Coordinates of C-alpha atoms and ligand atoms in Angstrom, one line a residue:
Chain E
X1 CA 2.0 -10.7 7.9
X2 CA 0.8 -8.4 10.5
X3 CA -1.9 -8.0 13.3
X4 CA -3.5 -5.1 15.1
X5 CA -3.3 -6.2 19.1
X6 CA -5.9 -4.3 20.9
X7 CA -5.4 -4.3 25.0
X8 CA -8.1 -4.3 27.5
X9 CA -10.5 -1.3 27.9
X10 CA -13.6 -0.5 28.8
X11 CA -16.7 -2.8 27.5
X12 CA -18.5 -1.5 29.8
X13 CA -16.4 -2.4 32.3
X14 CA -12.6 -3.0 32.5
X15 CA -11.3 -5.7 31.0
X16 CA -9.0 -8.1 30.8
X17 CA -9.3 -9.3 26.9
X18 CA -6.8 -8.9 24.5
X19 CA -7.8 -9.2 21.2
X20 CA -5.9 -9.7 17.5
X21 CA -7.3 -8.4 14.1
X22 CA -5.3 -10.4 11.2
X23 CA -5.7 -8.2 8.7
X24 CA -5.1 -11.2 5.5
X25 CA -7.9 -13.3 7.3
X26 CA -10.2 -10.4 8.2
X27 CA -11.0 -12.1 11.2
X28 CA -11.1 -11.1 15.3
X29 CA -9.4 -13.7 17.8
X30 CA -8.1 -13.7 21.4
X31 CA -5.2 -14.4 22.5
X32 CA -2.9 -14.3 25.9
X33 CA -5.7 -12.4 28.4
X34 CA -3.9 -9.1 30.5
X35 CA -3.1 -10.6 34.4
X36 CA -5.7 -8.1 36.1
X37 CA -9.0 -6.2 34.7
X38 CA -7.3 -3.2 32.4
X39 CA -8.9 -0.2 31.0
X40 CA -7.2 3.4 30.4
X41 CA -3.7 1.8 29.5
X42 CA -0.7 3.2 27.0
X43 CA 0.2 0.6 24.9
X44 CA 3.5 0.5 22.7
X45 CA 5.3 -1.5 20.4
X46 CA 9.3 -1.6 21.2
X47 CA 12.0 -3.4 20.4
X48 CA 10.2 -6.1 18.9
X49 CA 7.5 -6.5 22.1
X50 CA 3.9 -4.6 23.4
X51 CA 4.0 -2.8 26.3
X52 CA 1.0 -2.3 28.1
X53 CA 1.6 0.6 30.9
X54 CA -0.6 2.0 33.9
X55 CA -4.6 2.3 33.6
X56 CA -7.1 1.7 35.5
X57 CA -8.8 -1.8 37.4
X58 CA -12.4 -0.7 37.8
X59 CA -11.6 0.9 41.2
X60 CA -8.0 2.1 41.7
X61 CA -5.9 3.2 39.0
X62 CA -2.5 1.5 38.6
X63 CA 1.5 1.7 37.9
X64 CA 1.8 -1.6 36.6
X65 CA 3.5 -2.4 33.8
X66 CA 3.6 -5.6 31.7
X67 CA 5.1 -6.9 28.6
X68 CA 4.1 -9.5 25.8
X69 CA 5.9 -12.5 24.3
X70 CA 4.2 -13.7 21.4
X71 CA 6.1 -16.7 20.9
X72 CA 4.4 -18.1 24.2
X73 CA 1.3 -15.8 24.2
X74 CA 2.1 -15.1 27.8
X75 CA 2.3 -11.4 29.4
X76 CA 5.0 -10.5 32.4
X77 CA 5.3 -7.7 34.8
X78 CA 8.3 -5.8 34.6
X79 CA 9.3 -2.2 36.7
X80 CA 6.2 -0.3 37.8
X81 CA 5.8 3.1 37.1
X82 CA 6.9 5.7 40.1
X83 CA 3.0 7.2 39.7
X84 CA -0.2 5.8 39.5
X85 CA -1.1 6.9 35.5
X86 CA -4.5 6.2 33.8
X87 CA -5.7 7.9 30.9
X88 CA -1.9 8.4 29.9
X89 CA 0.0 9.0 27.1
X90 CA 2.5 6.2 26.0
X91 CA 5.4 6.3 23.2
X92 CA 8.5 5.1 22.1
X93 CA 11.7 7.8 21.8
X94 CA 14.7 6.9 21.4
X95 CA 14.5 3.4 22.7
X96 CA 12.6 5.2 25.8
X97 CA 9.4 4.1 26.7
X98 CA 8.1 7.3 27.8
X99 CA 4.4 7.6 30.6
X100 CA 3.5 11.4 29.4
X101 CA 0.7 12.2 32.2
X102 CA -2.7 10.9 33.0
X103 CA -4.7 11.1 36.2
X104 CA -3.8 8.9 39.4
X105 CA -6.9 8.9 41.1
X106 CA -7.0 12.3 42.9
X107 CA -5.2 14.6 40.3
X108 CA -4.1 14.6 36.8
X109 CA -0.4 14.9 35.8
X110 CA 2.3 16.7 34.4
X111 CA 4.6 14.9 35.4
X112 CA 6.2 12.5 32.6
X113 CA 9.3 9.6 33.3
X114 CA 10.7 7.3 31.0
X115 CA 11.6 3.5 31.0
X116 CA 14.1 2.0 30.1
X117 CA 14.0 -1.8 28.8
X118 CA 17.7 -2.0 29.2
X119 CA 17.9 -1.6 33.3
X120 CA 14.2 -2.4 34.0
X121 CA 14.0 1.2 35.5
X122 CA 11.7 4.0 35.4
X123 CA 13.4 7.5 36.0
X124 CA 11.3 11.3 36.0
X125 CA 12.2 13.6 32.9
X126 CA 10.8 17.2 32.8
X127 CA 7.5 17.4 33.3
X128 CA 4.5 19.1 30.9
X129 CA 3.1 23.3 31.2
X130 CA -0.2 21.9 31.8
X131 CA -1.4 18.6 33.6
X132 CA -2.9 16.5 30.9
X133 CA -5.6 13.5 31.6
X134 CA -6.6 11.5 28.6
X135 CA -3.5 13.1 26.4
X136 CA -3.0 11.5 23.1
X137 CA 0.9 11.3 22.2
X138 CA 2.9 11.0 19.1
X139 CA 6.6 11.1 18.1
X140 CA 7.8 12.5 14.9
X141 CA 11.6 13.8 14.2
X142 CA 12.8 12.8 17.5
X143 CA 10.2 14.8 19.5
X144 CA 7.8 13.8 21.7
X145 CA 4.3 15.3 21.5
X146 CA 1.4 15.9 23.8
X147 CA -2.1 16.9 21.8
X148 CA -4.9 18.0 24.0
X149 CA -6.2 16.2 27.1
X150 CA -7.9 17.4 30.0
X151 CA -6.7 19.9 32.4
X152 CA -8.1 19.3 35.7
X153 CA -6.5 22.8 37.3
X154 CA -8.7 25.0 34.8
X155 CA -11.5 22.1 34.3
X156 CA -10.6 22.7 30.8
X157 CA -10.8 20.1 27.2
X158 CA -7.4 21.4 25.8
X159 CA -6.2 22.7 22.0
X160 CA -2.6 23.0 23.4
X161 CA -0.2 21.2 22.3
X162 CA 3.2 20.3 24.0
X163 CA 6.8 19.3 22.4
X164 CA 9.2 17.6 24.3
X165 CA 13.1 17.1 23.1
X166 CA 15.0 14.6 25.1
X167 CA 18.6 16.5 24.5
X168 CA 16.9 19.6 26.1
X169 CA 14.6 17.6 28.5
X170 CA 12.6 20.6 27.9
X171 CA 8.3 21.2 26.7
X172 CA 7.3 23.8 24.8
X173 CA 4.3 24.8 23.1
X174 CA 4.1 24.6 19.4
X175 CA 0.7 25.9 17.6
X176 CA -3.0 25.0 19.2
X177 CA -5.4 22.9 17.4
X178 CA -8.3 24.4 15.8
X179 CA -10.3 22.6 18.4
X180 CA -10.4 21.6 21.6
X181 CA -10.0 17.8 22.0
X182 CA -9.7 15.1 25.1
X183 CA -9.1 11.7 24.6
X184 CA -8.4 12.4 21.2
X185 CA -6.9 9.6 19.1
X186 CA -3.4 10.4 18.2
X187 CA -0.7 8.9 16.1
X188 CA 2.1 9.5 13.6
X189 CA 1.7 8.1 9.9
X190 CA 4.4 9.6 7.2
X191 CA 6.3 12.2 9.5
X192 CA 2.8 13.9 10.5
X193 CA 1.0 14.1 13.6
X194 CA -2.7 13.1 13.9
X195 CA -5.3 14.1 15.8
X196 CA -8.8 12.2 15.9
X197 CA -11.5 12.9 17.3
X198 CA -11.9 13.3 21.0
X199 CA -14.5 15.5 23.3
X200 CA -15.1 19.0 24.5
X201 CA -17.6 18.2 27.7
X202 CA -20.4 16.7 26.2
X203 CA -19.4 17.1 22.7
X204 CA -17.8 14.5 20.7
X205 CA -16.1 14.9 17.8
X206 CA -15.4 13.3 13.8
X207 CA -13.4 15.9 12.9
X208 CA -9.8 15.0 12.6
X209 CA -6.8 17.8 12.1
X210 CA -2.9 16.9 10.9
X211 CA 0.1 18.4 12.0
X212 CA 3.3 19.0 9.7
X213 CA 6.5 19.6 12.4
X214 CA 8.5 20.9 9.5
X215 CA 5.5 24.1 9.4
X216 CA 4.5 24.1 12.8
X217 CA 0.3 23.8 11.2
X218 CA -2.2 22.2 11.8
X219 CA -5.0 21.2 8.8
X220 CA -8.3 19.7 8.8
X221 CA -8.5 16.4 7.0
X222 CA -11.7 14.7 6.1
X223 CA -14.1 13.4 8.9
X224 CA -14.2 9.9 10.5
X225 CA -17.4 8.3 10.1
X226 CA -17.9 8.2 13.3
X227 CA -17.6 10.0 16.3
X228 CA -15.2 8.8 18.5
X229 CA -13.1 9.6 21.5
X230 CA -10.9 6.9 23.9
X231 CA -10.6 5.5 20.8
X232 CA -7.0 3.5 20.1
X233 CA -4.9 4.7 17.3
X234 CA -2.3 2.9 15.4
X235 CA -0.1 3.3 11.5
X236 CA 0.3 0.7 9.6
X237 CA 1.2 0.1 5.9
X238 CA 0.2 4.0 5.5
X239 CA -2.9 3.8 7.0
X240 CA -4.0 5.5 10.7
X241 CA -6.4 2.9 11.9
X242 CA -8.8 4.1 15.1
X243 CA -9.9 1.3 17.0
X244 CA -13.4 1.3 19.2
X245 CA -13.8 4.3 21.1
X246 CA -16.6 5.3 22.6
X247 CA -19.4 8.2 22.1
X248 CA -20.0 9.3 25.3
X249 CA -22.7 6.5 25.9
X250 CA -22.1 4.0 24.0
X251 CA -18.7 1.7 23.1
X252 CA -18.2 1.0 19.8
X253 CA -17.3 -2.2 18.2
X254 CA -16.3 -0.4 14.6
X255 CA -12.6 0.0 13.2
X256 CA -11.1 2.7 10.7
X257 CA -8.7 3.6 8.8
X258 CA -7.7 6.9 7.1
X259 CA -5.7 6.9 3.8
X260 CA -3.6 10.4 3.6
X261 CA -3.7 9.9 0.2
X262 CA -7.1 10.1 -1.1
X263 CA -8.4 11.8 2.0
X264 CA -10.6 9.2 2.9
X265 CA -11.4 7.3 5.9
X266 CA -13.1 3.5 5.6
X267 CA -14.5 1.3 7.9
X268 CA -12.8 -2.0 8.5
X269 CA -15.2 -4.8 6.9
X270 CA -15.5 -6.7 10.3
X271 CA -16.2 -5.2 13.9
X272 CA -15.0 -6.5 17.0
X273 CA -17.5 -9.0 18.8
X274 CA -18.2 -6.1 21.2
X275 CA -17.8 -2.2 21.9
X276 CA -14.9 -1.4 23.4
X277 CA -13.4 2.5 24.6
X278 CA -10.0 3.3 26.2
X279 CA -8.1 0.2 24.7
X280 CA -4.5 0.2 23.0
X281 CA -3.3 -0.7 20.3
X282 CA -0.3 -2.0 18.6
X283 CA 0.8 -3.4 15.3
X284 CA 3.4 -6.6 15.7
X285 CA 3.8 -9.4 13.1
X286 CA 2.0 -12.6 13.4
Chain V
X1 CA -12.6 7.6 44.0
X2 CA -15.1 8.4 41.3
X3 CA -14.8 5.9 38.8
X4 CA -14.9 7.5 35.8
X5 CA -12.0 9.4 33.6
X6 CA -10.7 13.0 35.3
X7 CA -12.4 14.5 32.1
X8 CA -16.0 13.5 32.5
X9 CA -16.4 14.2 36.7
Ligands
CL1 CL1 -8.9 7.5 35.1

Protein backbone atom coordinates (compact mmCIF):
# COMPACT_ATOMS: atom_id res chain seq x y z
CA UNK A 1 0.00 0.00 0.00
CA UNK A 2 1.44 3.21 -0.92
CA UNK A 3 1.29 7.04 -0.17
CA UNK A 4 2.16 10.19 -2.00
CA UNK A 5 4.36 12.37 0.77
CA UNK A 6 4.12 15.87 -0.20
CA UNK A 7 7.04 18.31 1.55
CA UNK A 8 6.54 21.76 2.62
CA UNK A 9 5.99 24.57 0.09
CA UNK A 10 4.58 27.62 -0.31
CA UNK A 11 0.74 28.12 1.18
CA UNK A 12 1.24 31.25 0.96
CA UNK A 13 4.04 31.16 2.89
CA UNK A 14 6.74 28.60 3.56
CA UNK A 15 6.00 25.85 5.40
CA UNK A 16 6.74 23.41 7.45
CA UNK A 17 3.80 20.70 6.89
CA UNK A 18 4.34 17.46 5.49
CA UNK A 19 1.45 15.85 4.28
CA UNK A 20 0.45 11.98 3.13
CA UNK A 21 -2.30 11.10 0.51
CA UNK A 22 -3.20 7.27 1.04
CA UNK A 23 -4.34 6.47 -2.02
CA UNK A 24 -6.81 3.06 -0.71
CA UNK A 25 -8.39 5.47 1.92
CA UNK A 26 -8.63 8.51 -0.30
CA UNK A 27 -7.88 10.60 2.52
CA UNK A 28 -5.16 13.65 3.33
CA UNK A 29 -3.17 13.32 6.88
CA UNK A 30 -0.01 14.83 8.47
CA UNK A 31 2.52 13.38 9.63
CA UNK A 32 6.31 14.03 10.96
CA UNK A 33 6.36 18.21 10.37
CA UNK A 34 10.04 19.35 8.29
CA UNK A 35 12.53 20.91 11.39
CA UNK A 36 12.44 24.63 9.82
CA UNK A 37 9.75 26.60 7.43
CA UNK A 38 10.48 24.80 3.74
CA UNK A 39 9.41 25.92 0.43
CA UNK A 40 11.36 25.43 -3.02
CA UNK A 41 12.89 22.03 -1.95
CA UNK A 42 14.01 18.75 -4.26
CA UNK A 43 12.52 15.90 -2.85
CA UNK A 44 13.59 12.13 -3.61
CA UNK A 45 12.87 8.79 -2.80
CA UNK A 46 16.26 6.50 -2.37
CA UNK A 47 17.19 3.65 -0.98
CA UNK A 48 14.19 3.04 0.73
CA UNK A 49 13.99 6.83 2.42
CA UNK A 50 12.78 10.73 1.22
CA UNK A 51 15.16 13.16 0.93
CA UNK A 52 14.15 16.57 1.17
CA UNK A 53 17.26 18.86 -0.22
CA UNK A 54 17.92 22.78 -0.21
CA UNK A 55 14.90 25.52 -0.62
CA UNK A 56 14.06 28.22 0.68
CA UNK A 57 12.90 29.62 4.67
CA UNK A 58 10.85 32.61 3.83
CA UNK A 59 14.01 34.82 3.89
CA UNK A 60 17.36 33.08 3.06
CA UNK A 61 17.50 30.14 0.94
CA UNK A 62 19.21 27.06 2.36
CA UNK A 63 21.77 23.97 1.86
CA UNK A 64 20.20 21.89 4.33
CA UNK A 65 19.50 18.55 3.81
CA UNK A 66 17.30 16.12 5.75
CA UNK A 67 16.10 12.74 5.61
CA UNK A 68 12.85 10.71 6.72
CA UNK A 69 12.39 7.56 8.77
CA UNK A 70 8.93 6.46 8.58
CA UNK A 71 9.09 3.85 11.14
CA UNK A 72 9.46 6.72 13.75
CA UNK A 73 7.90 9.57 11.70
CA UNK A 74 10.87 11.65 12.63
CA UNK A 75 13.13 13.75 9.97
CA UNK A 76 17.25 14.07 10.49
CA UNK A 77 19.80 16.38 9.07
CA UNK A 78 22.43 14.79 7.27
CA UNK A 79 25.61 16.59 4.98
CA UNK A 80 24.49 20.05 3.74
CA UNK A 81 24.85 20.94 0.32
CA UNK A 82 28.30 22.96 -0.69
CA UNK A 83 25.71 25.81 -2.27
CA UNK A 84 22.82 27.40 -1.14
CA UNK A 85 19.99 25.78 -3.83
CA UNK A 86 16.24 26.70 -4.01
CA UNK A 87 14.15 26.13 -6.80
CA UNK A 88 16.45 23.04 -7.65
CA UNK A 89 16.31 20.11 -9.45
CA UNK A 90 16.59 16.80 -7.35
CA UNK A 91 17.11 12.99 -8.62
CA UNK A 92 18.31 9.80 -7.97
CA UNK A 93 21.27 8.29 -10.51
CA UNK A 94 22.90 5.62 -9.82
CA UNK A 95 22.51 5.50 -6.12
CA UNK A 96 23.58 9.45 -6.33
CA UNK A 97 21.44 11.90 -5.09
CA UNK A 98 22.19 14.51 -7.44
CA UNK A 99 21.30 18.96 -6.53
CA UNK A 100 21.00 19.98 -10.47
CA UNK A 101 20.91 23.99 -10.10
CA UNK A 102 18.50 26.41 -8.56
CA UNK A 103 19.12 29.93 -7.37
CA UNK A 104 21.05 30.79 -4.01
CA UNK A 105 19.85 34.07 -3.29
CA UNK A 106 21.95 36.33 -5.58
CA UNK A 107 22.38 34.09 -8.78
CA UNK A 108 21.04 31.02 -10.29
CA UNK A 109 23.22 27.94 -10.94
CA UNK A 110 24.85 25.78 -13.14
CA UNK A 111 26.57 24.25 -11.06
CA UNK A 112 25.27 20.57 -10.11
CA UNK A 113 27.10 18.06 -7.14
CA UNK A 114 26.05 14.84 -6.03
CA UNK A 115 25.49 13.04 -2.61
CA UNK A 116 26.29 10.20 -1.59
CA UNK A 117 24.28 8.27 1.22
CA UNK A 118 27.17 5.91 1.67
CA UNK A 119 29.97 8.64 3.08
CA UNK A 120 27.41 11.38 4.06
CA UNK A 121 29.30 13.69 1.43
CA UNK A 122 28.41 15.98 -1.10
CA UNK A 123 31.11 16.31 -4.00
CA UNK A 124 30.71 18.92 -7.42
CA UNK A 125 30.16 17.01 -10.90
CA UNK A 126 30.23 18.99 -14.16
CA UNK A 127 28.20 21.65 -14.12
CA UNK A 128 25.01 22.70 -16.79
CA UNK A 129 25.51 25.14 -20.43
CA UNK A 130 22.99 27.37 -18.97
CA UNK A 131 22.21 28.35 -15.28
CA UNK A 132 18.87 26.90 -14.58
CA UNK A 133 16.43 28.29 -11.53
CA UNK A 134 13.20 26.41 -11.08
CA UNK A 135 14.62 23.29 -13.41
CA UNK A 136 12.52 20.29 -13.43
CA UNK A 137 14.66 16.97 -13.58
CA UNK A 138 14.18 13.49 -14.67
CA UNK A 139 16.28 10.23 -15.15
CA UNK A 140 15.63 7.79 -17.81
CA UNK A 141 18.42 5.14 -19.18
CA UNK A 142 20.96 6.14 -16.87
CA UNK A 143 20.94 9.87 -17.82
CA UNK A 144 20.18 12.67 -16.01
CA UNK A 145 17.94 15.41 -17.44
CA UNK A 146 17.46 19.13 -17.03
CA UNK A 147 14.00 20.47 -18.85
CA UNK A 148 13.63 24.22 -18.91
CA UNK A 149 14.04 26.53 -16.00
CA UNK A 150 14.97 30.03 -15.78
CA UNK A 151 18.04 31.53 -17.01
CA UNK A 152 18.88 34.52 -15.06
CA UNK A 153 22.04 35.53 -17.43
CA UNK A 154 19.58 36.10 -20.53
CA UNK A 155 16.40 36.79 -18.23
CA UNK A 156 15.01 34.02 -20.26
CA UNK A 157 11.98 31.01 -19.50
CA UNK A 158 13.95 28.12 -21.22
CA UNK A 159 12.88 25.26 -24.00
CA UNK A 160 16.45 23.81 -23.61
CA UNK A 161 17.00 20.83 -22.45
CA UNK A 162 20.26 19.41 -20.87
CA UNK A 163 21.54 15.57 -20.63
CA UNK A 164 23.94 14.61 -18.24
CA UNK A 165 25.92 10.99 -18.25
CA UNK A 166 27.81 10.25 -15.09
CA UNK A 167 30.67 7.98 -17.08
CA UNK A 168 31.34 11.16 -19.11
CA UNK A 169 30.51 13.70 -16.35
CA UNK A 170 29.59 15.64 -19.34
CA UNK A 171 25.90 17.97 -20.47
CA UNK A 172 24.77 18.16 -23.63
CA UNK A 173 21.88 19.41 -25.32
CA UNK A 174 19.38 17.03 -26.71
CA UNK A 175 16.21 18.60 -28.74
CA UNK A 176 14.24 21.92 -27.24
CA UNK A 177 10.72 21.68 -26.26
CA UNK A 178 8.11 23.13 -28.27
CA UNK A 179 7.62 25.59 -25.56
CA UNK A 180 9.26 27.48 -23.29
CA UNK A 181 8.66 26.28 -19.73
CA UNK A 182 9.95 27.32 -15.93
CA UNK A 183 8.96 25.54 -13.09
CA UNK A 184 7.63 23.06 -15.12
CA UNK A 185 6.65 19.72 -13.51
CA UNK A 186 8.82 16.98 -14.64
CA UNK A 187 9.06 13.33 -14.16
CA UNK A 188 9.74 9.88 -15.74
CA UNK A 189 6.74 7.27 -16.10
CA UNK A 190 7.60 4.16 -18.56
CA UNK A 191 11.15 5.15 -19.89
CA UNK A 192 9.73 8.71 -20.99
CA UNK A 193 10.38 12.08 -19.87
CA UNK A 194 7.54 14.49 -18.88
CA UNK A 195 7.14 17.85 -19.00
CA UNK A 196 4.06 19.76 -17.30
CA UNK A 197 3.14 22.67 -17.34
CA UNK A 198 5.25 25.53 -16.13
CA UNK A 199 5.42 29.51 -17.12
CA UNK A 200 6.86 31.82 -19.75
CA UNK A 201 6.68 35.32 -17.63
CA UNK A 202 3.26 35.78 -16.97
CA UNK A 203 1.98 33.00 -18.85
CA UNK A 204 1.17 29.74 -17.38
CA UNK A 205 0.67 26.78 -18.96
CA UNK A 206 -1.71 23.16 -19.27
CA UNK A 207 -0.02 22.07 -22.02
CA UNK A 208 2.11 19.10 -21.25
CA UNK A 209 4.92 17.60 -23.95
CA UNK A 210 6.76 13.84 -23.63
CA UNK A 211 10.02 12.97 -24.45
CA UNK A 212 11.14 9.42 -25.95
CA UNK A 213 15.36 9.19 -25.33
CA UNK A 214 15.40 6.39 -27.64
CA UNK A 215 14.17 9.33 -30.69
CA UNK A 216 15.44 12.26 -29.16
CA UNK A 217 11.43 13.98 -29.69
CA UNK A 218 9.42 15.57 -28.02
CA UNK A 219 5.27 15.25 -28.44
CA UNK A 220 2.39 17.02 -27.06
CA UNK A 221 0.13 14.97 -24.92
CA UNK A 222 -3.34 16.01 -23.89
CA UNK A 223 -3.72 19.03 -21.48
CA UNK A 224 -3.86 19.13 -17.67
CA UNK A 225 -6.90 20.56 -16.42
CA UNK A 226 -5.43 23.01 -14.89
CA UNK A 227 -2.79 25.28 -15.27
CA UNK A 228 -0.07 24.76 -13.18
CA UNK A 229 3.52 25.59 -12.53
CA UNK A 230 5.77 24.81 -9.08
CA UNK A 231 3.65 22.14 -9.09
CA UNK A 232 5.30 18.59 -7.60
CA UNK A 233 5.42 15.68 -9.92
CA UNK A 234 5.61 12.10 -9.01
CA UNK A 235 4.94 8.10 -11.08
CA UNK A 236 3.34 5.75 -9.51
CA UNK A 237 1.57 2.52 -10.65
CA UNK A 238 1.75 4.17 -14.26
CA UNK A 239 0.34 7.15 -13.55
CA UNK A 240 2.27 10.93 -13.44
CA UNK A 241 0.50 12.56 -10.62
CA UNK A 242 1.09 16.64 -10.34
CA UNK A 243 0.57 17.76 -7.00
CA UNK A 244 -0.66 21.69 -6.10
CA UNK A 245 1.17 24.13 -7.93
CA UNK A 246 0.32 27.31 -8.27
CA UNK A 247 -1.15 29.83 -11.14
CA UNK A 248 0.75 32.72 -10.75
CA UNK A 249 -1.72 34.08 -7.93
CA UNK A 250 -3.19 31.57 -6.59
CA UNK A 251 -2.02 28.00 -4.80
CA UNK A 252 -3.81 25.25 -5.64
CA UNK A 253 -5.18 22.59 -3.47
CA UNK A 254 -6.08 20.13 -6.63
CA UNK A 255 -4.10 16.71 -7.49
CA UNK A 256 -3.74 14.92 -10.99
CA UNK A 257 -2.82 12.33 -12.66
CA UNK A 258 -2.16 11.54 -16.32
CA UNK A 259 -2.74 7.93 -17.71
CA UNK A 260 -0.23 7.45 -21.01
CA UNK A 261 -2.56 5.14 -22.06
CA UNK A 262 -5.73 6.64 -22.75
CA UNK A 263 -4.27 10.16 -22.92
CA UNK A 264 -6.14 11.44 -20.26
CA UNK A 265 -5.48 13.36 -17.27
CA UNK A 266 -8.04 13.13 -14.03
CA UNK A 267 -8.37 14.99 -10.99
CA UNK A 268 -7.73 13.16 -7.72
CA UNK A 269 -11.39 12.88 -5.97
CA UNK A 270 -10.01 14.72 -2.79
CA UNK A 271 -7.96 18.07 -2.64
CA UNK A 272 -5.57 18.87 -0.12
CA UNK A 273 -7.01 21.03 2.93
CA UNK A 274 -5.19 24.02 1.38
CA UNK A 275 -3.30 25.35 -1.87
CA UNK A 276 0.03 24.66 -1.87
CA UNK A 277 3.02 25.61 -4.77
CA UNK A 278 6.71 24.61 -4.76
CA UNK A 279 6.23 21.29 -2.65
CA UNK A 280 7.86 17.73 -3.33
CA UNK A 281 6.80 14.85 -3.69
CA UNK A 282 7.59 11.29 -3.24
CA UNK A 283 5.96 7.92 -3.38
CA UNK A 284 7.03 5.42 -0.28
CA UNK A 285 4.93 2.57 1.12
CA UNK A 286 2.82 2.94 4.11
CA UNK B 1 17.05 39.47 -0.94
CA UNK B 2 13.81 39.59 -2.93
CA UNK B 3 11.72 36.95 -1.70
CA UNK B 4 10.36 35.57 -4.41
CA UNK B 5 11.70 32.72 -7.05
CA UNK B 6 14.73 34.09 -9.62
CA UNK B 7 12.06 33.57 -12.36
CA UNK B 8 9.31 36.00 -11.28
CA UNK B 9 11.89 39.28 -10.10
CL1 LIG C 1 14.26 30.95 -4.67
Amino acid sequence: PKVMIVVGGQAPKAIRSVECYDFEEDRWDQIAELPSRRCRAGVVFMAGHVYAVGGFNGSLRVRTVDVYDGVKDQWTSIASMQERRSTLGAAVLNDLLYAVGGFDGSTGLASVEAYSYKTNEWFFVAPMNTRRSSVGVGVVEGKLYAVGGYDGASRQCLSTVEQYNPATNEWIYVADMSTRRSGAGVGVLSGQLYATGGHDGPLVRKSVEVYDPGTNTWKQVADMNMCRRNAGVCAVNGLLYVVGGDDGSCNLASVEYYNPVTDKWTLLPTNMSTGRSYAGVAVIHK
Amino acid sequence: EPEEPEADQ
